[PDB]
Symmetry: C3
Subunit: 631 residues, 3 copies
């Protein structure tokens, strides 16, 4: 009952699902109780083929059957699922539902200003997706290409993503808050052939310069051949470059409301999602989609009658998986909110839920803290009795915020799903299944299907057996929606996720496991570099070098090494002193913590320099490293 | 029994199919009787999924099965059939028959001069199609590209079409009678990367300049990268442009007689066919693959009653939809021989059609009333020279067939022993819409009879826009749901498609025709409502002719209307006002100078019957031309013009009447 | 009993398979005796549909079923097999075995110097093929393209061929001994978009100029957009051209250990192989089936066996029987980079003993070199693992046949004299291991689907009866028959199909004795 390590768990009563949850539930739940959940989970770990095989044929529609459910290992970074299978993301998110019930709502779009809100049915969505795909197809976009999206969180963003996927190309969504420089970096790394954007945006009543920032970036993006521009404000002063920029409404009017979707392999890339050097996290098609549908269905308890409001942005993985793919795969309506939680006032989130009788709400604690600070009294003004599942994503939720969320939004009648996951996981890793798992406020509870979670000692990399334990959070095998690579940089992928703790997937997070098996996310770890099995701290070495009174500044970075895995390179600003500094680190940290080399002369720049790859300071590091690295 | 609206039907005895039809029929008919037809038709309307699903799985060979028979609505212009399916048109027209019986005749080609006639088996056709496709593939032609064809009605035209379709590309066939300008317009709108043509043609013994017209147009077609030229005359004086033009025989010799066909989706475009309407710019009608092919096979089989033992002679040209569907795709899908006639009905004499039928013992003949009117006028005495006892189905396409011509067709060609199929349809419908099924539906001469499978026809009141319930009715002819072979768009101009076919009568397809429905449910086509002119089976745009006349800088205004013609069905009458003209002695010469303009701009077949020189055209208060007055005068109905005090220039009406009365004859 | 024409057949004793062959055989033979072979052979001629249909389904893995087994005729040069079906050469050679037994050896690579030797399992091979395929895919290589290979006989050559076929493109292997001009003529004729080579080579201890020859030829090969250069020696002084030349290790590191294979049609080109030089084209399904069929039955390969084909991927022998044949059957294949003389003349035998190779395939030219200067080295090594010895490329004199059988085979192995050409794809006439008794100097009976005949050159009429001589020809096409000469089908017709219309012209003269055994006389 008592915990000596997981202090968070001491004195925490399980919180059973409120009875009103099941009264509002449209059908019998997908899982009866925790005993059934454990039986299914154990199979998903010991017999992935027998577990995910049938589910993949149930939840997804295939153009070609797969012959192997699961292939590859973490250690080799060659994970693959449903090999030989072929499918299309937009067919599974649009076509199949439009044929069944074309009038069912698909995108409930709430604009920055409600006067501009509107609803697209699945039939409406198929026509818009088909028309945009037709425009891109006539522009030469085909399987294997990348297309950039720089759009606000509205229908056009969702249509653009699904149209790109309809042709077998990968979309790369760029958050509409990014600067021109951030657009340039991501477009060039992906070598996008086309870009979809709009003239201007609306956020909190203000006008944002969307197209203007694209033009600024495009002067340095030679791969972009054509741009489709939607008239979001229809400002006549917004310039379009002849021969490159074309209007969404003008071009889409030329094409018919049906276009055949293009089959892609299960392991063909569905999208690139750049992370904040930006890395293009790449996701497969079949595996990702299954994870999105599976987690949306079982963790949120989503039925055909339900309505999902994910207060996220397609610019981030949350919007990808739980505003778009998850809900549309299951054929339910999804609420796409373009504005802010405060405009026109601080009751907007709740006005939207009441308007559309949303049954599921998914938001980040950052937004809950704001509404608690400035708009708490607005919540009671709205009927929120349609809700039964309240989700939280992206960051620790304190027990105090959990209770506030539970009381003021849920009226102590909803289930709360504190979902732990990350961009590279594609979908939920640890979360309480709605109506199944009892909650402990601040704990994500059990690992999800196909997620064999473990705790690793950060020094030895060895799994920690038993409960009341703490350590590095790691997964012991790959899972269907796991990211497959970093675009054209698979070595950075291996060095980040598979090599730090060989045989495991490295989440970068620390966590604790209590006597009931519940996981408590404890936050980021301290970025250790693995040199021949000894894990080193770049920050700890910098501190040891600085202790030398002749040293004024010190910067230590890590790079890939073909022999020792990683190598540590230390840069110092003030031959015999170089050896004295290495001896200093040995006697301070340890004999095996000595840098591979000490160079007397933004660590992002130092890493690339060390691997042969105040702006005026950059010159000194390049020439200094190239002259004294030698031995 | 009595009709108050449909006067055509009053006193019209049903004409049962002659007994000799069933003695000549090689097998049990495809449909038992008219009652079975009604039952099947109702299912094609109420349960399209259960009806067309099985038929598509019987008649077409699939590389991938379809998961949904039917999608979309007219109102949204998103029709689709057999979604998820994959197939190839050339596989279903050639490969599968060549494997079954490679020696069976496929293309029975009758050249302009019979000494050049020849027969291609299905095996022969597979090898040539593979070779031409091999050339196009090495030129970079791939799925999604368009390829132009400018060929006479011969074996090379069919081979070109099937080779383009073998690669997954869409062909755009350009009628060999078109001028250079008309070739330019069609090639540029489709952005064709390649063109297939020949050096010269043969028609009626005369030599036609095919390649010469391409060179002229290609100076303004920057997208065309390479041209394949067949040696039809092998005239060494025909220039080939280095680096662009290549010889069919030289290039095809580099590639093998088999090329794997390329799978395409049911809804990938099979071809573009540019059509004239009421706009003045030709619009490229687009057809899907699966739906179009099924319609072609289904109508060829059930309306004409085509069996494997049969032989079909469609007296048409692939430059028009009739040759597409019923000289090529229809018959080849069903695996029967089809007769490809390069010549005219008059050369070497007016018995050619019947010499061909007798030579090859054709069982089915498909022709335009324009030819029947000509053969009745000039060649009736030729029929008795030929044995036509192999025929049992006589078809009529493209224009109204008067009861007199119907009787003439029935007696002098069919010997009152064949079934007649007056087929109503149009380019955008892909295949037959209303037609009497051979051996099943009794005929009323001049009536297309019942709508075909999947065609829910209706009549719409022109005043109220509401559908007319009940029979003995007349109105705008409209279709209430889309059908497999319905055109899917206008190339890169889907808005023009919607505004033309789907938006005029929301929820319906607008055929452009008016029609009447009698007490028996038989439909009587009454002609276009949208002032489209059909001259000798050729669908023309009055606006496109006006534009050609205006290009002549000696012309200031031009207005073109249509009238009835005892020979061509309809005739085009052009009214022209000259800037600073006069010269009554130069009038005869200037009228011919304008006719030559239309020939060199559009083509010889678009030339007006008559050009009328007037001082100015009757216009409205806003200055726009009142073509109604030109129509009424041109049809001798000048006493029906009515109140003209709403024109800005009512005094011009007197001049129009006298000008037409003075220059129409001479 | 006596031969008036086939003087080679007079007084030649049949040589039954030694009993030790069957003691070393891991499983029951695939054919019991000659009488069971003749039943199968007659069906493969009278009924190609019912014979090769089921065999194609047993031996190859299909992504799409085929609808017609056989189409076309020789006279029309439109031969085709398994029409409508789709597959992938690299899936059948790598993927499907890696999923079953990822740790089974695939490429037993013996380098010029043994210190550099290594072994790739099927699991290893799948990851290397995928990374190299992923490189080519990013460079724009797609189905329909050709990619040239200028590599020695080592892992990288087999990985390049399989990685090119993985995308649906056609590899055009160029023997690493060719001059810059010979490289140029082939690259331009095929219009390759990319090339895969190495910096330098090691043969017999000598360093060979590989990249330097490519660069000399590339100055006249505009179609080549990018070159992948492996570091076989890692010599710093080897110039890579900025913007065109990239390093194998550097690019492959950017891509994952799995890439989905691309489906191709049965009759899509698997490769071009040049013999001015003419690009012989082989289909995918036909060629692969013939390769697996001949390897399974003429050599009597079983899953437990280990094939050592001392050939070179620059020629057809390395295509069909160093790579596609053994990999399709999921057995390990031995890839030897160096010469039989370095470090000494016991190199072949030290290799056979090292990896317990069960099959050995070599040309008589190497046998004449070893009989001349390496006969003493054979006794030092243990060759008791062998049971099938192969001869290819040249006529084998009864002298060489008797020396090959005793010194190498210890008079305990079966010798298969395989006669075939680059245009045949696989064996045309050969003695099946453990089935067909031997006559030294003879190739014995035609193989499945090979209807062999003799034609009188003067009269051009097929010669009925036995004890005959004349030009050798086949009466119908077979699955692995070359389908054309790249972009020049007329040269193909004039060479093979038009000399004797209705027949395939081998260009060789042969004799058939009263037992039906064929004797290859040579070129006409
Ligand atoms: C979800 C998506 C937006 O995340 P990313 O942007 O990829 O960042 C992922 C990182 O976020 C943090 N995290 C996500 N979920 C939770 C949670 N439930 N409790 C506590 N920390 C959480 C972790 O540090 C994770 O590695
Ligand atoms: C068939 C193909 C060549 O037609 P298009 O050239 O596309 O022109 C179509 C138009 O032709 C006319 N029409 C066709 N068939 C008949 C018929 N049986 N009776 C009376 N009018 C007919 C109609 O006005 C139709 O809209
Ligand atoms: C195998 C491959 C490398 O051959 P190619 O390089 O295409 O040359 C083929 C020519 O080689 C000769 N030949 C091959 N095998 C034998 C043999 N067993 N007995 C006698 N002559 C043989 C023949 O003249 C053949 O036409
Ligand atoms: Cl594996
Ligand atoms: Cl040291
Ligand atoms: Cl719909
Ligand atoms: Cl054939
Ligand atoms: Cl050479
Ligand atoms: Na396919
Ligand atoms: Na398939």
């Amino acid at each position: 009952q008592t915990h000596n390590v997981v202090h968070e768990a001491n004195g925490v009563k399980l919180r059973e699902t409120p009875k009103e949850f099941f009264e509002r539930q449209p059908n019998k739940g997908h899982i009866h109780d925790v005993n059934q959940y454990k039986q299914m989970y154990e199979q998903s770990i010991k017999d992935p083929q027998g577990f995910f095989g049938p589910l993949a044929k149930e939840l997804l529609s295939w153009d070609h059957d797969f012959h192997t459910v699961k292939s590859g290992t973490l250690k080799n970074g060659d994970a693959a699922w449903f090999l030989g299978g072929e499918l299309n993301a937009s067919y599974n998110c649009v076509d199949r539902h439009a044929f069944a019930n074309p009038d069912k709502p698909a995108l409930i779009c709430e604009a920055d200003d409600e006067k501009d809100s509107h609803i697209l049915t699945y039939g409406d969505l198929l026509r818009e997706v088909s028309k945009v795909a037709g425009v891109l197809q006539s522009w030469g976009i085909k399987k294997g290409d990348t297309v950039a999206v720089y759009l606000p969180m509205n229908a056009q963003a969702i249509i653009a993503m699904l149209a790109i996927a309809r042709l077998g190309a990968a979309h790369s969504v760029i958050f509409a808050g990014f600067s021109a420089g951030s657009i340039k970096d991501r477009v060039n790394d992906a070598s996008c052939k086309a870009l979809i954007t709009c003239d201007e945006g609306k956020r909190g009543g203000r006008t944002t310069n969307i197209k203007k920032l694209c033009d600024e970036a495009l002067v340095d993006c030679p791969t972009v051949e054509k741009v489709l521009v939607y008239k979001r404000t229809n400002n006549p002063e917004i310039h379009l470059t002849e021969g490159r920029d074309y209007y969404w409404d003008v071009e889409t009017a030329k094409f018919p409301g049906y276009l055949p979707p293009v089959s892609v392999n299960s392991e063909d890339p569905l999208f690139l999602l750049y992370t904040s050097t930006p890395k293009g996290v790449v996701h497969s098609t079949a595996g990702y989609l299954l994870g999105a549908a599976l987690s949306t269905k079982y963790i949120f308890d989503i039925h055909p009658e339900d309505i999902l409001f994910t207060a996220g942005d397609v610019g981030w993985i949350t919007g990808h998986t739980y505003a778009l793919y998850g809900p549309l795969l299951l054929g339910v309506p999804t609420i796409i909110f373009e504005g802010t939680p405060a405009y026109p006032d601080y009751g907007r989130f709740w006005q939207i839920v009441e308007k559309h009788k949303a049954t599921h709400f998914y938001v980040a604690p950052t937004a809950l803290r704001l509404l608690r600070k400035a708009g708490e009294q607005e919540i009671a003004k709205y009927d929120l009795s349609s809700l039964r599942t309240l989700g939280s994503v992206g960051e620790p939720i304190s027990p105090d915020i959990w209770e506030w969320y539970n009381e003021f939004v849920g009226k102590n009648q909803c289930h709360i799903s504190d979902t732990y996951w990350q961009t590279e996981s594609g979908s939920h890793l640890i979360a309480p299944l709605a109506g199944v798992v009892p909650n402990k406020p601040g704990s994500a509870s059990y690992p999800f299907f196909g997620i064999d979670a473990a705790l690793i000692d950060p020094v030895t990399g060895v799994e920690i057996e038993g409960n009341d334990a703490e350590g590095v959070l790691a997964i012991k095998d790959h899972w269907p929606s796991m990211a497959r690579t970093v675009y054209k940089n698979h070595t950075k992928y291996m060095d980040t996720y598979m090599n730090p703790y060989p045989g495991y997937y490295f989440t970068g997070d620390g966590a604790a496991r209590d006597h009931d098996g519940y996981y408590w996310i404890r936050g980021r770890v301290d970025d250790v570099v693995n040199v021949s099995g000894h894990r080193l701290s770049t920050a700890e070495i910098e501190a040891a070098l600085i202790e030398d009174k002749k040293v004024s500044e010190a910067a230590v970075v890590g790079i890939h090494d073909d022999i020792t895995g990683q190598a540590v390179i230390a840069y110092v600003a003030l031959e015999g002193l170089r050896k004295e500094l290495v001896l200093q680190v040995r006697k301070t940290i340890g004999p095996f913590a000595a840098p591979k080399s000490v160079i007397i002369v933004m660590r992002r720049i130092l890493r690339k320099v060390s691997s042969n790859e105040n702006p005026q300071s950059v010159e000194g590091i390049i020439s200094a490293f190239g002259a004294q690295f030698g031995k």
